[PDB]
Ligand binder design. Structure first.
Ligand SMILES: COc1ccc(S(=O)(=O)N(CC(C)C)C[C@@H](O)[C@H](Cc2ccccc2)NC(=O)O[C@@H]2C[C@@H]3[C@@H](O)CO[C@@H]3C2)cc1
Ligand SMILES: [Cl-]
Ligand SMILES: [Cl-]
Lengths: 99, 99
């Protein structure tokens, strides 16, 4: 699809067996999801943005379905105010910025 | 152009006759720039990012070139970790997300 930016570019995702709404975010290096359980090992990480940093759990090799497209990669889980699909998974679904 | 997301979508902007680097950020509603001087009066605004809420200076109707495209609109000035071009100016340069 072609998504305009008049409003937030929100899409439905499936992760960990759950449906969520998330932002397609070209300004995010990584994918950051609100607190949930995911299987496997994880390690702590700190990520920083406007406001400062939050501690997250880093899970690798997680499959997400993003607007009907499957990707795999690292997902960070923690107290983000919004679910964010970052560049690590946007690349996998072939997303580009066009103007 | 078509910009892929394997790397940060950094572009050159020009504001106040100065060149700066900024991130095209579809996850940002607003454009937020590091401390600089701008003309006119400003208004207060609070914005909430990943790490909490900060205070910024809101300047309206500011001339800014983005990747060689001309925009005129609201620029928020404050302690952001990187200059971010948000949807208020991404729409002015005709940007869309495509996959
Ligand atoms: C390492 O991976 C990372 C992934 C993401 C981030 S980041 O989220 O800090 N982040 C990294 C950027 C700052 C370099 C990604 C951004 O797109 C961020 C997304 C956002 C939206 C709403 C609430 C909170 C965050 N937008 C964001 O900070 O936008 C600001 C805050 C205000 C919100 O209402 C939405 O727009 C207004 C302008 C940092 C690191
Ligand atoms: Cl990854
Ligand atoms: Cl590609």
């Amino acid at each position: 699809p072609q998504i305009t930016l008049w409003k937030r570019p929100l899409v439905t995702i499936k992760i960990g067996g759950q449906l969520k709404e998330a932002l397609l975010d070209t300004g995010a290096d990584d994918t950051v999801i609100e607190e949930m359980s995911l299987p496997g090992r994880w390690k702590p990480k700190m990520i920083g943005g406007i406001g400062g940093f939050i501690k997250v759990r880093q899970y690798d090799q997680i499959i997400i379905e993003i607007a009907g497209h499957k990707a795999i990669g690292t997902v960070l889980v923690g107290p983000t105010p919004v679910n964010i699909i970052g560049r690590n998974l946007l690349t996998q679904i072939g997303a580009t910025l066009n103007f």
